Structures are given as C-alpha cells and as structure tokens.
Design a protein around this ligand. Structure first.
Ligand SMILES: C[C@H](Cc1cc2c(c(C(N)=O)c1)N(CCCO)CC2)NCCOc1ccccc1OCC(F)(F)F
Length: 277
C-alpha cells in the first residue's frame, strides 16, 4: 500500500520541522550551560543530562520513527529495528530517570537551602547520574532481551511487543515507578514551599522551572502509558490506530518542547539563550 507522496508530504515536512526544532533546542540547552561557567551546578548538570536524553531521542529515534510512519513500513533490516526499539525504550527511560533524580535534587535543595551544597556536590551527584544511566540501561534492554517476542518473518513488519508479560513491567518500571518518586518528591517540595532566603528564593525558582518541565513530561507521556497497559488488559477496549499515533507523537513532541520551557520559565536561562544566540 504505497501512500501517496503528495498527501504525506505535509506530514513528513511537519515531522521533520518538529525534529529539527527539538534538536536545535536541545543543543541550545547544553551549549548555554557549557559556554557559561556562571551556570554550572549539580542541577544544571542534570538539566544537561535531560537535554542529552532528548538529543538521543531526537537524533536516533525520531527521524527513523517519522520515516517509518510516513512510509508505513520498515525498510531497514530486523537488527536495525531491534536496535532502534531498544534505543527508544532506553532514551525515554533515561529522560524519566533524569527527571526523578532532578526531583530529588530540587527536594534536597529546597528542604535545606543553605546546607544543600553539602548533601550533593559535583562528586556525589555524578555517582547518582551514572547510577540512573545504568538503571535505565538495565531496565530498558533487559525487558527487550529477556522477553523478546519471536522475530517476524517479514523485514517490513516490526512492531512493539504485543505480549502483556513484557509491556506490563516495562511500563511499570519505566514510567509508573519512576513517576511515584517524582510525585512524592514534588509533593514534599510544594508543601515545603508553602509552609516556609536569597538561596531559598533561587532554589524555589529552579524547583518551579523543573516542576513545569516535569508536569509537561508527565502529562504528555501519561496517555501512552495509560492506554497501552489498558489495551493489554482490555483487548476489547483498544482505541483506534489514530489514538495510538497521536499519543506516540505527543510522547515525542514532549521532548521536542522540553527546551522551550527553560527560556520562558527561568530568566537566567533566557539570558543564557540570548547570549548564545
Ligand atoms: C512505542 C513507540 C515505538 C513506536 C511503535 C509503532 C509506531 C511508531 C511511529 N509513530 O513511528 C513508534 N507505528 C507507526 C505506524 C505504522 O504504520 C506503529 C507502531 N516508542 C515510544 C516510546 O515507547 C516506550 C518508551 C519507554 C517504555 C515503554 C514504551 O512503549 C513500548 C511498549 F511496548 F511498552 F508499548
């Protein structure tokens, strides 16, 4: 079923423009931190980590996914699809884990604004960063490696694991369990901010910025992680393919958007972006 080139050209151009916007935003978010030595810290390094996760999503996953969508079939080989799926599942996991370890950074930095640089330093936060990378890698490849469904005969048919056994714990350990550690850390941050100086004000401003980021991420991803398990349990209530398309693309455009939040929310990042431009 060769889709008309003219009809799908609009979709292809839209997806390409979104991917380029996300990529440029992600390089900008990293370049602002790197060039400016007035804007480096454990939380800023974690923001750069999230930017790198978005870069991995938008430089190795999006282009291929958009090509697959517009074409409608997987031109490349089986091994290439297997690596692409693993890269996707691990980059999303890396982004969410970065979020959940930014949720602890901004809980420590709000509960103890003055003693904060003592609990976490450039040597202690990096251990957590590497640990979360390792955890994301093992919880991403593991489900794929451990619970792969049999390889399809056709090279142009390569879709996600329909088996509930995988999807259940993959989603749970990739989104829901990391999401609990975010919703509890930010609940504590909010209650602390309400009940509760210059350092405290800066910490609360950074907490609010990262809270906007976390909210956007969670709201955008929740449709997919709520529909796919529901479809797994409830095959009778699986939505239309359009629903799947829109939810996946929302889960991607969230990473595409992520860069915009920093300039619009935090004035410091706004100056950094202006200087870099
Ligand atoms: C799931 C998705 C991959 C994907 C799948 C399919 C596409 C596309 C596309 N738009 O190119 C992308 N289709 C295109 C239409 C064909 O004609 C048909 C099917 N990656 C997002 C992120 O996934 C997880 C990231 C982290 C944890 C769980 C995830 O869930 C995977 C699941 F198996 F659990 F659902």
């Amino acid at each position: 079923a060769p889709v008309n080139i003219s009809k799908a050209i609009l979709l292809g151009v839209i997806l390409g423009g979104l991917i380029l916007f996300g990529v440029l935003g992600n390089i900008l978010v990293i370049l602002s931190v790197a060039c400016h030595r007035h804007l480096h810290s454990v939380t800023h390094y974690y923001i750069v980590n999230l930017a790198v996760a978005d870069l991995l999503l938008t430089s190795t996953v999006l282009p291929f996914s958009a090509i697959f969508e517009v074409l409608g079939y997987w031109a490349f080989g089986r091994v290439f699809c297997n690596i692409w799926a693993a890269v996707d599942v691990l980059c999303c996991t890396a982004s969410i884990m970065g979020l959940c370890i930014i949720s602890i950074d901004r809980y420590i930095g709000v509960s103890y604004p003055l003693r904060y640089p003592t609990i976490v330093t450039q040597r202690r936060g990096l251990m957590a960063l590497l640990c979360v990378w390792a955890l994301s890698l093992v919880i991403s490849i593991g489900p794929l490696f451990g619970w792969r469904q049999p390889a399809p005969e056709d090279e142009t048919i390569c879709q996600i694991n329909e088996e509930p056994g995988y999807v259940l714990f993959s989603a749970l350990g990739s989104f829901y369990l990391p999401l609990a550690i975010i919703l509890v850390m930010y609940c504590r941050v909010y209650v602390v901010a309400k009940r509760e100086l210059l350092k405290f004000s800066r910490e609360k401003k950074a907490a609010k910025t990262l809270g906007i980021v976390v909210g956007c991420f969670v709201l955008c991803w929740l449709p997919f992680f709520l529909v796919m398990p529901i479809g797994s349990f409830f095959p009778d209530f699986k939505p239309s393919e359009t629903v799947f398309k829109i939810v996946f693309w929302l889960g991607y455009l969230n990473s595409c958007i992520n860069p915009i939040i920093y300039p619009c929310s935090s004035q410091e990042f706004k100056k950094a972006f202006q200087n870099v431009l």
